[PDB]
């Protein structure tokens, strides 16, 4: 297709490896570029941790209000929200919001702990039919993004399908799905990524991720005005361990996909 030629040209111009999956919910059509290759998830994995806690709250109705202590020893490398609450508590709701909307790594580690470790996050993925996602490490080491390392990876196709199920499908209860959507729509880290390649009038909920090897990711649900929503996953990684982030590549991929509809 024209879109795949343009995405391949974009990739060639970028020097890295680009993975894209689009699901158009109007007809369930899919556009894939390197759709079945593994990419490091980096912070995009926080969506799965938050959703797993939301799933627990379907049975434990008050779980999201449970206070969780933030101690100095809990702080890792990037904790914009948790740092404001050291020697205090945050609820699981506040930690989920922080992990999603500010990419707080301490918050992610608390969500992982609540689930019984990375294996508990992976288990949730398996329970909703995602056989590809794997979370192996906690923050910050899950972002090493080493070429060829399968730890902490997924594929674009799998993540697009999973994100669709979590936000537009019924993998979560109705209250929980709405909460997840609200959290994603309120993300603060995404202005230069998928959002930057889309009409300003469209509503986007997204989760970015970045890591070593210049890994630059974004996963989004998109509500165009007057049209069925879309799910778009854009993963990008580079050959040099110290490469700089390339959010512009994600914006450009989003622009190419949007042109094709």
């Amino acid at each position: 297709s024209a879109v795949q030629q343009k995405l391949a040209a974009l990739e060639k111009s970028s020097g890295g490896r680009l993975g894209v999956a689009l699901i158009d919910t109007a007809d369930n059509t899919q556009v894939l570029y390197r759709g079945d290759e593994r990419f490091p998830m980096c912070s995009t994995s926080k969506v799965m941790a938050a959703a797993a806690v939301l799933k627990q709250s379907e049975t434990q109705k008050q779980l999201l209000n449970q206070p969780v202590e933030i101690k100095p020893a809990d702080l890792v490398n990037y904790n914009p929200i948790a740092e404001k609450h050291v020697n205090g508590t945050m609820t699981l709701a506040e930690l989920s919001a922080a992990a999603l909307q500010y990419s707080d790594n301490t918050a992610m580690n608390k969500l992982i702990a609540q689930l019984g470790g990375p294996g508990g996050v992976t288990a949730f993925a398996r329970a909703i039919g995602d056989e590809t996602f794997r979370l192996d490490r906690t923050e910050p080491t899950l972002n090493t993004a080493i070429p060829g390392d399968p730890r902490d990876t997924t594929t674009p196709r799998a993540m697009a399908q999973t994100l669709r199920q979590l936000t537009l499908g019924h993998a979560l209860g109705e209250t929980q799905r709405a909460q997840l959507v609200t959290w994603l729509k309120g993300n603060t880290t995404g202005a230069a990524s998928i959002r930057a390649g889309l009409p300003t009038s469209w509503t986007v909920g997204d989760k970015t991720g970045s890591g070593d090897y210049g890994t630059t990711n974004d996963i989004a649900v998109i509500w165009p005005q007057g049209r069925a929503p879309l799910v778009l996953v854009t993963y990008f990684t580079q050959p040099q361990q110290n490469a700089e982030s390339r959010r512009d590549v994600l914006a450009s991929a989003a622009r190419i996909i949007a042109e094709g509809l």
Side-chain angles (χ1 to χ4, degrees):
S1 59
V3 168
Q4 280 172 336
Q5 289 183 21
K6 280 171 150 186
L7 290 172
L10 172 67
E11 183 182 59
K12 184 170 176 194
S13 79
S14 78
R17 183 171 64 100
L18 177 64
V20 181
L22 171 76
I23 298 168
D24 185 348
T25 65
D27 48 11
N28 295 335
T29 54
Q30 290 198 354
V31 174
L32 299 169
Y33 186 81
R34 299 191 188 283
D36 295 309
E37 297 190 19
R38 274 181 185 277
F39 286 84
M41 287 187 283
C42 302
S43 289
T44 66
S45 61
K46 291 171 181 166
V47 174
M48 194 74 81
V53 172
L54 285 172
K55 174 54 69 174
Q56 290 184 325
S57 78
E58 292 179 23
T59 304
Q60 302 173 64
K61 305 307 223 72
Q62 289 264 84
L63 180 59
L64 293 190
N65 309 302
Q66 178 181 119
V68 175
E69 213 176 357
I70 307 298
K71 305 308 301 175
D74 290 324
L75 300 173
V76 287
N77 61 325
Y78 185 66
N79 339 286
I81 307 304
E83 273 163 2
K84 304 184 185 279
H85 300 285
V86 184
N87 295 302
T89 57
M90 298 176 58
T91 68
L92 281 168
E94 289 163 352
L95 289 160
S96 298
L100 293 178
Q101 300 181 326
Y102 293 88
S103 221
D104 187 299
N105 282 344
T106 293
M108 170 62 155
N109 281 352
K110 292 294 185 182
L111 300 177
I112 294 173
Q114 167 62 28
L115 298 164
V121 183
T122 303
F124 172 70
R126 296 290 180 276
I128 66 172
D130 184 330
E131 292 257 323
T132 305
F133 178 96
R134 52 182 291 177
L135 192 72
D136 294 275
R137 285 171 295 172
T138 60
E139 296 285 2
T141 59
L142 67 85
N143 302 296
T144 53
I146 289 156
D149 184 359
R151 293 178 294 177
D152 306 301
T153 60
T154 197
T155 66
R157 187 204 291 269
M159 187 63 109
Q161 297 174 341
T162 289
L163 190 63
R164 188 215 178 128
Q165 281 299 109
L166 290 174
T167 58
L168 305 171
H170 293 81
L172 301 170
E174 305 288 16
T175 295
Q176 289 75 22
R177 178 181 75 166
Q179 180 60 273
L180 179 57
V181 163
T182 290
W183 281 335
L184 291 168
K185 286 175 181 176
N187 181 36
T188 74
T189 66
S193 300
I194 286 172
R195 284 169 197 264
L198 297 181
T200 52
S201 69
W202 290 7
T203 301
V204 181
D206 81 294
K207 178 75 199 79
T208 56
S210 62
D212 290 347
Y213 287 87
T215 297
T216 311
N217 301 332
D218 198 12
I219 67 175
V221 189
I222 299 155
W223 291 270
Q225 296 176 353
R227 196 211 185 283
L230 310 160
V231 176
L232 176 59
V233 163
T234 58
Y235 284 92
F236 182 69
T237 193
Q238 299 181 70
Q240 307 89 0
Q241 177 175 38
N242 56 350
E244 72 199 334
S245 303
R246 291 290 307 275
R247 298 183 201 86
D248 64 293
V249 167
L250 309 187
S252 287
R255 188 177 301 104
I256 284 159
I257 291 281
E259 257 149 25
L261 300 146

